[PDB]
Amino acid sequence: EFQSIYSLDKLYPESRGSDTAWRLPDDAKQANDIPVDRLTISYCRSSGKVNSKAEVRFHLASADWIAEPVRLKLAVKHKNRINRSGELILTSECSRYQFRNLADCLQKLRDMIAEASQPXXXXXXXXXXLRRSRIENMNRERLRKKRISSA
């Protein structure tokens, strides 16, 4: 019950009582990004380098916390990591503490949701990696270009 002139009530008069530091402001964040309870979170623990795999699963059509445009456009750009059961699958490796792996997967998830939710994204194409792809595409286009009615 001792006090000094430097104590925490005198430095900060506004918030004093013990209960004030421990209150929970659930209303300030009401959007609850990524409602973790509805995700399947798997841990593959390997040891040799130590690498703890973080796995992240949810059903895209069945997930309500994402709006329909978000649902459908996250199913397009990302179709490579989608599973036949309708699952979107996220993978994390680098840390050997599974905490950071979870954080990485949740972050990739927030980035896919962000990039999809922003309509103004022009998906900028680099000509450096895709130049050979554009050339080979045009060149197979010149062969496809033969016009005769078939079948």
Add this chain to the structure above:
Amino acid sequence: VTRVFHQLLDMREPVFEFVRPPPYHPKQKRFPHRQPLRYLDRYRDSHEPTYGIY
């Protein structure tokens, strides 16, 4: 292709990658002589500190 494997063959679709053999390092020596500091990091197991008994 994804339409094939699932609908026809009732099978998960395989995905392959390209692996290039890990760069060869000479045996590490107890007193590496005349080497840069970063020499130590070539034999690095994984990147994370480990406080052994601490």
